[PDB]
Each structure stands twice: as structure tokens, then as C-alpha cells.
């Protein structure tokens, strides 16, 4: 089964998921001087006021917080998107050291971590159908740099000791994802894929220009999670990121000059 190690990591994934060598794979390097400002791009509309978080889970490749997506409670609209996209979950990718961990890069710069807020297009009825469509998902990506603490992250950080190993989950109600957003919603956008298997080419990526700052203590708690299940030899959950993939016949657009 796939992972991030020497023998099952990103360079091997194409054997079980041949789309890994496809025409619209993610992540990519964002060359800021080559991205084109698109004045027809609308501001992002993030409506998270009624979000209902449910659970937090260690799935063996990251940890994720899941939301009730059975109604339009937390939705993303506008920007490059047509229609309404419901928030399903968020998760992170991070490194073993502060100089790596993000999936997207900016002028080849890697951030310490990357937050992905995953949304699906309500016209397709459920996320399983949406993943089969070229415009099925919208992922909002937010970079994390290490500096001052992010208060809105602390409730996540403080529960991680209860989901140390693969398969563990915990109740995680009343979490407000608005506390994870930077001040500015300026963004880059391009058509891409899931960054983990099945690597489906169904994602409109929206990557925010402004990172959030988290403290060294906060990211250190991410690095104490385990890839392995309970009772197995311990392998710290670090460096769970896919490297940048070829841009091929794609242009990255910017919402800002
Ligand atoms: N990192 S991402 O591009 O935001 C992303 C967003 C939503 C997703 O569903 C996945 N992929 C996933 O969760 N795979 C789980 C194992 C099942 C494969 O058989 C990746
Ligand atoms: Zn992700």
C-alpha cells in the first residue's frame, strides 16, 4: 500500500495509479513572475459561519477534521468557481524540518506545512460522484510558516495526543475553520488533481498568497503523530507531502497584481 517511504512513496505511486503521470497533476511550483493576473477572476466567497465539525481522525497519511456536508452549511463560492462547493474536511501536509513540508511551492520555496480545505461541487450530489468530474472539487490551500502561534489552530493541536496512531478518531465538535484563514484572500488558481492516491484529476486549486504563522510548538505536535497503527513499529508522521509535478499545458492565474 502507498505511503511516503523509500519503497512506497511518490515515485512509486504511478504503478498502482497510472494517472500519476497525467496531464493535470498536483502539486506544482507556482512561478510568481509567470502567473498571469486575470482581472475577470472574482473575489473568493468563504461562508463558514454555520460549519459543523464532527470528528478528527488519523488516517495513516495525515490527520483530518470532517464536517457535516449534508446541507449548505460551510461553502466556498466565487473566485474561479461556478456554483457552490461544500466543505467536507480539512487536513495538513508537513515536514520533518521547517524548510520543507508544503506540497505547492512558490518560486521553488517550500513552506513548513500546507493546509488543504476540501470542498465538492453540489451539482454532483456527493463527493464520490464529484471526484469523477473535472470540476468536481475545489481545494483551498494555505501555507504555514513557523513564527508566532496561530490561536485558531490550538484546539486542533491539543487533541492530537488522542489520535497518535493510524485509525484513531475523536469527537471534534464546534471547531470554527475561520480561525485558520489569513487576512487576505488573494490567490493563485489552476486545474489539477488530488495530491494523494487516487490522484484523480478533479480539482480546481485555489492557493492563497498569504501564509499563516504557527509556532514551533504547534508544528512539533504535528511531528509527534505516527504513520503506523497502535502496536506496530513507530514511524513518525513527517514529510507526508508529494513533490511538485510538471505543469505541462497549464497556466496559473493570479487574482491580484
Ligand atoms: N491532498 S488533497 O489533494 O487536498 C486531497 C483531497 C481530497 C482527497 O479525497 C484526497 N485523497 C484522499 O483522501 N485519499 C485517501 C486514500 C484513498 C485512495 O484510495 C486528497
Ligand atoms: Zn492535501
In the annotated binding site for substrate, the residues are 195-196
Nearest CA to ligand 1 atom 4: 116
* Residue pair 212/182 in contact by the 8 Å Cβ criterion: yes
The 8-class DSSP code of residue 109 comes to B
Q: Whats the size of the chain, residue-wise?
A: 257
Angstrom distances, CA of residue 47 to CA of 176, 177, 254: 11, 10, 21
For residue 114, give the ligand nearest its CA. 2
The 8-class DSSP code of residue 136 comes to S
* Residue pair 96/238 in contact by the 8 Å Cβ criterion: yes
Resolution (A): 1.1
Which residues, judged by CB distance below 6 Å to any ligand atom, belong to the binding site of ligand 1?
116, 118, 139, 194-198
In the annotated binding site for Zn(2+), the residues are 91, 93, 116
- For residues 154 and 172, what is the distance between their CA atoms, to the nearest angstrom? 13
- Residue 18 backbone phi and psi in degrees, to 5: -65, -20
Angstrom distances, CA of residue 56 to CA of 147, 156, 159, 187: 25, 9, 9, 27
Residue 33 is among the residues annotated as catalytic for this protein: no
What experiment produced this structure?
A: X-ray
Indicate the Cα dihedral angle 244, 98, 93, 63, nearest 10°: 170
Q: Which of 1, 12, 33, 61 is catalytic?
A: 61
Amino acid at each position: 500500500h502507498w505511503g511516503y517511504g523509500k519503497h512506497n512513496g511518490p515515485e512509486h505511486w504511478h504503478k498502482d495509479f497510472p494517472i500519476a503521470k497525467g496531464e493535470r497533476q498536483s502539486p506544482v511550483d507556482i512561478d510568481t513572475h509567470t502567473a498571469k493576473y486575470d482581472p475577470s477572476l472574482k473575489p473568493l466567497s468563504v461562508s463558514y459561519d454555520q460549519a459543523t465539525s464532527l470528528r478528527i481522525l488519523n488516517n495513516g497519511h495525515s490527520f483530518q477534521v470532517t464536517f457535516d456536508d449534508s446541507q449548505d452549511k460551510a461553502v466556498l463560492k466565487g473566485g474561479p468557481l461556478d456554483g457552490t462547493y461544500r466543505l467536507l474536511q480539512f487536513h495538513f501536509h508537513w515536514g520533518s524540518l521547517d524548510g520543507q513540508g508544503s506540497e505547492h511551492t512558490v518560486d521553488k520555496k517550500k513552506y513548513a506545512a500546507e493546509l488543504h480545505l476540501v470542498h465538492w461541487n453540489t451539482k454532483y450530489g456527493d463527493v464520490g460522484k464529484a471526484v469523477q468530474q473535472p470540476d468536481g472539487l475545489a481545494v483551498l490551500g494555505i501555507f504555514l510558516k513557523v513564527g508566532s502561534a496561530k490561536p485558531g489552530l490550538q484546539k486542533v493541536v491539543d487533541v492530537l495526543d488522542s489520535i497518535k496512531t493510524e485509525g484513531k478518531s475523536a469527537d471534534f465538535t464546534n471547531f470554527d475553520p475561520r480561525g485558520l484563514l489569513p487576512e487576505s484572500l488573494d490567490y493563485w488558481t489552476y486545474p489539477g488533481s488530488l495530491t494523494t492516491p487516487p490522484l484523480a484529476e478533479c480539482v480546481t486549486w485555489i492557493v492563497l498568497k498569504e501564509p499563516i504563522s504557527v509556532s514551533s510548538e504547534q508544528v512539533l505536535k504535528f511531528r509527534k503523530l505516527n504513520f503506523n497503527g497502535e502496536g506496530e513499529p513507530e514511524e513518525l508522521m513527517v514529510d507526508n507531502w508529494r513533490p511538485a509535478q510538471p505543469l505541462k499545458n497549464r497556466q496559473i492565474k493570479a487574482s491580484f497584481k
